[PDB]
Design goal:
GO terms for molecular function: heme binding; iron ion binding; methyltransferase activity; sterol 14-demethylase activity. The structure is a monomer. This protein has 528 residues and is an alpha+beta fold. The chain has 19 helices and 12 strands. A hairpin with a 6-residue loop joins β6 (385-386) and β7 (393-394). The chain is globular, with a radius of gyration of 26 Å. The protein starts with a helix and ends in an 11-residue tail after the last strand. The structure holds protoporphyrin IX containing FE (HEM) and ligand TPF.
Length: 528
C-alpha cells in the first residue's frame, strides 16, 4: 500500500501551511537558496553550455563584483574557465566571449541571432525619447545613423574646428575653473571641467549657436537632470515614482521641445542651410520606404547622439589630462609637434592641420586603449546560437557580452598593456582602420572583419559613427590645452582608478590637476 504515502504527502502539505510565520517566511528564503545551488550543480553537467560562474544569492548573481571590478572579474573567470563563460546578472544570464574571437561572435553576429535594442531599449528610450535609436527596428536605426553621418563630413569638420576652438578659448576666458586673463595658475577637477567643455563644444558645432546660447541660462539645469537619467539603474528600475525620474522625463520633454521649436521655426522661415546637425536632419531624415522622421523623432535623435557623445568624449578628455598630468615628457613632446605643425603658433588650427599631428592623435588613441569608456557591450540572444569550434550553444533568452576594452589591457596583444605609451602607435595614428574587406549595413562602408584586438568604437552594424567627430573635438581641445597650459598632479596624487559603476568608465573623482599658463601674459580677446 503506497496509498498511505500520498496521504502523508497531503498531510505534510497541510502541516507545512500551518507552520509559524517565523518558520514559513524562512522557508521562502531557504528553499530557493537551496534550489539555486542544486540547479547550478546540475547545470555544470551540461556540455552544450559554457561554464557558469557560481553565485550564492539567487537572481542577484555575480552582480556585485561585476559592477565594481568587471575586468578583474573577467580575468579570474578567464583563468578558471577560459574565454567563454556565463554568469548571472540581476535576473539575466550573461554569456561572455573574451578576446578577438569574442569580438567576432558578438559584433558580427547575425541580425536574426542577436538584438541590441532588446538589450538597451530600457536604458535609452526613457532618456532620449520614443521612436529612435533602440525604440525602433534595426533598419530604422541603420538609416538614422546614415542621417547623422551626413552632418559628419570632412567639410563639416573644417567648419567645426574654428567653432570648437572658439568654445575652448571662451571657456579658458570665462569659466571660474580657469579665468586665464586673471589667473596664471589654478587647480581644477577634470570631472567638472571636461563635461562642461564637452557640452559647450558639442552643442556649438552639432546643434548650432541657438542651442549653445541656451546653455548659458537656467536651461542648462535640464541637461543636468536629463544627464542624471542616463544611469545603469534603468536596466533594473526604468521608471519609479521618484523625483529623479520626474525631472528626467521633464527634461526630455523640455529639451526636445526646444529642439522642435527651433526646427519648426527654421522651416517656418526656410532658414534651412548647412550649419549644424539640425539643418542636416531637417533636409535628410526620410527613410527609404518614404516615411519621414517627425520633428519629435528628429529632436529625440539629437538628444541620444549628443548625450552618447557627451559621456564618451568627456570621460576620454578627462583621462587624457590625467595621464598627461604625470607625463611632462609627453606634454613636452606634444608641444613641440604643435610648434612644428602650427609654425610656432602663427598658423590657425584647421581640420587639415589636425591630421598632421600624429602624436596628438596617438595620445587619443592610447587613452582610448587604456580607457575604453564602455567596458561591456550587450546583445540579447534571439535564436539559439552555436559557438564555432565548440559544442557550446547559447540558448535564446541569454545575453551575450563583448568587452574589447578588456582585450585592450592584455599583454598578449599590447605589450606592457598597463603602461601609457603613445609611441606604441608610431606610424599608426589613425583613429582605426579596416585591415581589409568592407561591408555597408546602411550607413556607409565599414570593416567586414571585427577581429582587431583594438576596437574602441566597436564593429558591425552597431559600430560607432562619431569616431571622426570625437577625434576632431578631442583634437582641437587637446591642441589648445597643450599650447596654452602645462599641468601636473598635487603632490602624492596619481592617475585615479576607473569608476566602472557609472554609464561610462570615467575616472574616480575628484581627479584634480594643477594647471599653469605657458604664457602668463597671454590674454584671450572678446567681450564678457
Ligand atoms: C571617444 C568617443 C567614443 C567612443 C569610444 C565610442 C564608442 C562606441 C562604441 C563601442 C559603440 C558600439 C556600441 C555597441 O556596439 O553596442 C558606439 C556606437 C555608437 N556611437 Fe559612439 N563612441 C564615441 C563617441 C561618439 C560620438 C561623438 C557620437 C556622435 C556624435 C557617437 C554616436 C554613436 C552612435 C550613433 C552609435 C550607434 C549605436 C548602435 O548602432 O547601436 N559616439 N560608440
Ligand atoms: O552605445 C551607447 C549606449 N550605451 C551602451 N552601453 C552604454 N551606453 C553609448 N555610446 C557609444 N558611443 C556613444 N555613446 C549609445 C549609442 C548611440 C547613441 F545614440 C547613444 C548612446 F548612448
Amino acid at each position: 500500500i503506497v496509498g498511505e504515502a500520498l496521504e502523508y504527502v497531503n498531510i505534510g502539505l497541510s502541516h507545512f501551511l500551518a507552520l509559524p510565520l517565523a518558520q514559513r517566511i524562512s522557508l521562502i528564503i531557504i528553499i530557493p537558496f537551496i534550489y539555486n545551488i542544486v540547479w547550478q550543480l546540475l547545470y555544470s553537467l551540461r556540455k552544450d553550455r559554457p561554464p557558469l560562474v557560481f553565485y550564492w544569492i539567487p537572481w542577484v548573481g555575480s552582480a556585485v563584483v561585476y559592477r565594481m571590478k568587471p575586468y578583474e572579474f573577467f580575468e579570474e573567470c578567464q583563468k578558471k574557465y577560459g574565454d567563454i563563460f556565463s554568469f548571472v546578472l540581476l535576473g539575466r544570464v550573461m554569456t561572455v566571449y573574451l578576446g578577438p574571437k569574442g569580438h567576432e561572435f558578438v559584433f558580427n553576429a547575425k541580425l536574426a541571432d542577436v538584438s541590441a535594442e532588446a538589450a538597451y531599449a530600457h536604458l535609452t528610450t526613457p532618456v532620449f525619447g520614443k521612436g529612435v535609436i533602440y525604440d525602433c527596428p534595426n533598419s530604422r536605426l541603420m538609416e538614422q545613423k546614415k542621417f547623422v553621418k551626413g552632418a559628419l563630413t570632412k567639410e563639416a569638420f573644417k567648419s567645426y574646428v574654428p567653432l570648437i576652438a572658439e568654445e575652448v578659448y571662451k571657456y579658458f576666458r570665462d569659466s571660474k575653473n580657469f579665468r586665464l586673463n586673471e589667473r596664471t595658475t589654478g587647480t581644477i577637477d577634470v570631472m567638472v571641467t571636461q563635461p562642461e567643455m564637452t557640452i559647450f563644444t558639442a552643442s556649438r558645432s552639432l546643434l548650432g549657436k541657438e542651442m549653445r546660447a541656451k546653455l548659458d541660462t537656467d536651461f542648462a539645469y535640464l541637461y543636468s537632470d536629463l544627464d542624471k537619467g542616463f544611469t545603469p539603474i534603468n536596466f533594473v528600475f526604468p521608471n519609479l515614482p521618484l523625483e529623479h525620474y520626474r525631472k528626467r522625463d521633464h527634461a526630455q520633454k523640455a529639451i526636445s521641445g526646444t529642439y522642435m521649436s527651433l526646427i519648426k521655426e527654421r522651416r517656418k522661415n526656410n532658414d534651412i542651410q548647412d550649419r549644424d546637425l539640425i539643418d542636416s536632419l531637417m533636409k535628410n531624415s526620410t527613410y527609404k520606404d518614404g516615411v519621414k522622421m517627425t520633428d519629435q523623432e528628429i529632436a529625440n535623435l539629437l538628444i541620444g547622439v549628443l548625450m552618447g557623445g557627451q559621456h564618451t568624449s568627456a570621460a576620454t578628455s578627462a583621462w587624457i589630462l590625467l595621464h598627461l598630468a604625470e607625463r611632462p615628457d609627453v606634454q613636452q613632446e606634444l608641444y613641440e609637434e604643435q610648434m612644428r605643425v602650427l609654425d610656432g603658433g602663427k598658423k590657425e588650427l584647421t581640420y587639415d592641420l589636425l591630421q598632421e599631428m600624429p602624436l596628438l592623435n596617438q595620445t587619443i588613441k592610447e587613452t582610448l586603449r587604456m580607457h575604453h569608456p564602455l567596458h561591456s557591450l550587450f546583445r540579447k540572444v534571439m535564436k539559439d546560437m552555436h559557438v564555432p569550434n565548440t559544442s557550446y550553444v547559447i540558448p535564446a533568452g541569454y545575453h551575450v557580452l563583448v568587452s574589447p576594452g578588456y582585450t585592450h589591457l592584455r599583454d598578449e596583444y599590447f605589450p606592457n598593456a598597463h603602461q601609457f605609451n603613445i609611441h606604441r602607435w608610431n606610424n599608426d595614428s589613425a583613429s582605426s582602420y579596416s585591415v581589409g574587406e568592407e561591408v555597408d549595413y546602411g550607413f556607409g562602408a565599414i570593416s567586414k572583419g571585427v577581429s582587431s584586438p583594438y576596437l574602441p568604437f566597436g564593429g558591425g552594424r552597431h559600430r560607432c559613427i562619431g569616431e571622426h567627430f570625437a577625434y576632431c573635438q578631442l583634437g582641437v581641445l587637446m591642441s589648445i590645452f597643450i599650447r596654452t597650459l602645462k599641468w601636473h598632479y598635487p603632490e602624492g596624487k596619481t592617475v585615479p582608478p576607473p569608476d566602472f559603476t557609472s554609464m561610462v568608465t570615467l575616472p574616480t573623482g575628484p581627479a584634480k590637476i594643477i594647471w599653469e599658463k605657458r604664457n602668463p601674459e597671454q590674454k584671450i580677446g572678446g567681450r564678457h
